[PDB]
């Protein structure tokens, strides 16, 4: 089988810089017919892989010419000039010279943008959910960078830890920031038994937390 090696699991570049992604094959992909059977695709979270380069160096229609592919017979490079938010994702090479077709392990492109503090928003349980019997309190910590961040919940001044569910998005396709959603789920009775609800976010862009709160009976 032909082994397609993508040496870099991940590569960081700051917006605007150019970057090069390498992929090597265990045998020449150049056919006697003159074509080099190598593809490059970009896959974004939740999307099917998208064609970037075919025949090793042809730019696919619809793809920005900031992208290019070149190579010898066994060493290939995908070059991206002026990297921007929409380029973040995982890049994969694929050989289709011989069966079985084989993919490289992929190279994730990470955009090292500027730091940014999170914009926080808190949301009380919806009347629908309460009628339903449960009570979830949601806080969104949006458009911040870097990825690390922490959230603390306090009910009537005391920290609450069980019932929390956190989730981080992948880098935003437009500004390369991250956002995180934290949901505190309580029983309705529990929720109705207390008044002050708060979520506090601590990010490296500050020693003091960005907090949002609300009082149930206000």
């Amino acid at each position: 089988d032909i082994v397609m090696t993508q040496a870099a699991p991940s590569v960081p570049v700051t917006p605007g810089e150019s970057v090069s992604i390498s992929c090597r094959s265990s045998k020449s992909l150049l056919h006697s017919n003159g074509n080099t059977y190598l593809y490059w695709f970009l896959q974004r979270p939740g999307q099917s892989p998208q064609l970037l380069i075919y025949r090793m160096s042809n730019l696919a229609s619809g793809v920005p010419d900031r992208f290019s592919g070149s190579g010898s017979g066994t060493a290939f490079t995908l070059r991206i000039s002026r990297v921007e938010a929409e380029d973040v994702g995982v890049y994969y090479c694929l050989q289709h010279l011989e069966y079985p077709f084989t993919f490289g392990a992929g190279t994730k492109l990470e955009l090292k943008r500027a730091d940014a503090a999170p914009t926080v928003s808190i949301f009380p349980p919806s009347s629908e959910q309460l009628t339903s019997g449960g009570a979830s309190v949601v806080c969104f910590l949006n458009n911040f960078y870097p990825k690390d961040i922490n959230v603390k919940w306090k009910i009537d001044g005391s920290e609450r830890q069980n019932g929390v569910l956190n989730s981080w998005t992948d880098q935003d396709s437009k500004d390369s920031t991250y956002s995180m959603s934290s949901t505190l789920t309580l029983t309705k009775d529990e929720y109705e038994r207390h008044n002050s609800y708060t979520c506090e976010a601590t990010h490296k862009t500050s020693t003091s937390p960005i907090v949002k709160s609300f009082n149930r009976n206000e």
């Binding site: 892989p49 069966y99 077709f101 992929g106 949301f123 969104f140 949006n142 995180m180 949901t183 609300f214």
Partner: protein, 211 residues
């Protein structure tokens, strides 16, 4: 338009088999190869095998030879991949892709979840601000299996949106999404969360109302 249509999801019992479908349109189904690719959550792509619809000639990756069987129905222009005796190692997104000349086209992929648990529809909750810009949200709680597709105003509102990856907790998934618009815009102009969950054939709309 060249397109390959695949169901969004398949819930399969451990040990049972599953047969994925890939309906083609926009070109002559018989003249081009249909390939199948596997991808586990967070991992890379793997080639399973392919088939030439006009003749049903096939090539399989040795790794999947005892797991997959590729067939087609030329009369409905559909390609199929049957996977036998599924285990948790088979849970993955499976794509079908064709190749027209040098150009490959991909289906959106089917997420196969191998589980003994029952499919459960999500409860969708509107998240309005506590009683410049304003941020609204939508909570999609307690469903199974993945995935759910969420949009706002039917896809019309896409800027300023953050849709958070589903997280599994206590055997059920939870997902949420937020959207930020200019405050003078809401509530004068409505904002509605549209949530679809393939596995339960459900599609719900929740309009965000001021508290």
């Amino acid at each position: 338009q060249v397109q390959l249509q695949q169901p969004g999801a398949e819930l399969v019992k451990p040990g049972a088999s599953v047969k994925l479908s890939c309906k083609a349109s926009g070109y002559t189904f018989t003249n081009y190869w249909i390939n199948w690719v596997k991808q586990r959550p967070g991992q890379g792509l793997e080639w399973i095998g392919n088939i030439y619809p006009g003749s049903s000639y096939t090539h399989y990756n040795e790794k999947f030879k005892n797991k997959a069987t590729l067939t087609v129905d030329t009369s409905s222009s559909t390609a199929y991949m049957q996977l036998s005796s599924l285990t948790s190692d088979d849970s993955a997104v499976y794509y079908c892709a064709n190749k027209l000349g040098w150009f490959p086209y991909w289906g959106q992929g089917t997420l196969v979840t191998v589980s003994a648990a029952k499919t459960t529809a999500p409860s969708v909750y509107p998240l309005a601000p506590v009683c410049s810009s304003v941020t609204l949200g939508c909570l999609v709680k307690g469903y199974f299996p993945e995935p759910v597709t969420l949009t706002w105003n039917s896809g019309s509102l896409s800027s300023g949106v953050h849709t958070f990856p589903a997280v599994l907790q206590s055997d059920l998934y939870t997902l949420s999404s937020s959207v930020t618009v200019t405050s003078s815009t809401w509530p004068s102009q409505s904002i509605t969360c549209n949530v679809a969950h393939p596995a339960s054939s459900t599609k719900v709309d929740k309009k965000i109302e001021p508290r």
